[PDB]
Design a protein around this ligand. Structure first.
Ligand SMILES: [Ca+2]
Ligand SMILES: [Ca+2]
Ligand SMILES: [Ca+2]
Ligand SMILES: [Cl-]
Length: 294
């Protein structure tokens, strides 16, 4: 393992805000996208395995990691649509080319799957794990975290997240099988040290999960990429997890019907990158080497 970040953080202005990202190497990109409540830091022990396979990139979503916070912030800020506008602009600014390999997780998968559907001719391959592959019902949501997420999606959310930082301090460690070090937790809470709106992205995200028809716009978007991915011949690498969390039950059954897909299983709950980084990295590397023969 290791608590040290992969590369130095670079900054670029997007829509008036500064966004942070890692960009190492040259050639076609291998784009790693984190979800909630993480950052590019999530891929620190995985990206090394792809050394020499291309341009390794990991962006910090707006309001997360070292990226600027949006202000004024509130209940209407940091919705999926807003994150998409910033990420779309950042990915355009990075000049990725037309043979991109996406490596996604959680909300990074929702964003990545949607981007892929919209820019399909530029996607060489898609690696995903513990993703939001389709709209779901409450019965599809992990039983142990069901109550808590329903709470985030209620008036109690602000206190749980903005005041007590529950997503970072409780959910994150709770969904990692091995104990994190002081340094690792420090890196994860750094973007959310201040109570209040600074933590808004970690609350807006759970309120955006397409569950039981709400929110309607994200449900539609997920419905769209779910259908497309179930038909797309683009090469895929599905990293299943045991016991896993989000991508289990019906969603897992669905993902397993996707075309031209290779699958492996690694130990982990949700933030599996912290449990089996080497297995995950090795699998992604092999996937990319097959996609970029030489
Ligand atoms: Ca080329
Ligand atoms: Ca309940
Ligand atoms: Ca734990
Ligand atoms: Cl979430």
């Amino acid at each position: 393992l290791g608590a040290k970040p992969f590369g130095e953080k670079k900054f670029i202005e997007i829509k008036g805000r500064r966004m942070a990202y890692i960009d190492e190497g040259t050639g076609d990109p291998i784009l790693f996208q984190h979800g909630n409540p993480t950052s590019s830091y999530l891929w620190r022990n995985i990206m090394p395995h792809c050394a020499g396979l291309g341009r390794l990139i990991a962006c910090d979503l707006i309001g997360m990691g070292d990226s600027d916070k949006l202000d004024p912030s509130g209940p209407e800020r940091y919705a999926y649509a807003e994150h998409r506008d910033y990420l779309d602009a950042l990915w355009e600014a990075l000049d990725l080319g037309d043979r991109v390999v996406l490596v996604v997780h959680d909300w990074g998968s929702a964003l990545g799957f949607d981007w892929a559907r919209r820019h399909r001719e530029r996607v060489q391959g898609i690696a995903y794990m513990e993703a939001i592959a389709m709209p779901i019902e409450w019965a599809d949501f992990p039983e142990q975290d069901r109550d808590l997420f329903q709470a985030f999606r209620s008036q109690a959310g602000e206190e749980l997240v903005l005041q007590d930082n529950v997503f970072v301090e409780q959910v994150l460690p709770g969904l990692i099988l091995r104990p994190l070090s002081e340094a690792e937790m420090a890196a994860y809470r750094e973007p959310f040290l201040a109570a209040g709106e600074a933590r808004r992205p970690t609350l807006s995200w759970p309120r955006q999960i397409p569950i039981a028809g709400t929110p309607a716009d994200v449900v539609a978007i997920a419905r769209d990429y779910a259908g497309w991915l179930s038909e797309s011949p683009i090469p895929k690498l599905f990293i299943n997890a045991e016991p896993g969390a989000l991508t289990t039950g019906r969603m897992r059954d669905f993902c397993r019907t996707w075309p031209n897909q290779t699958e492996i299983t690694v130990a982990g709950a949700h933030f599996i990158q912290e449990d089996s980084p080497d297995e995950i990295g090795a699998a992604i590397a092999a996937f990319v080497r097959r996609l970029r023969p030489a």
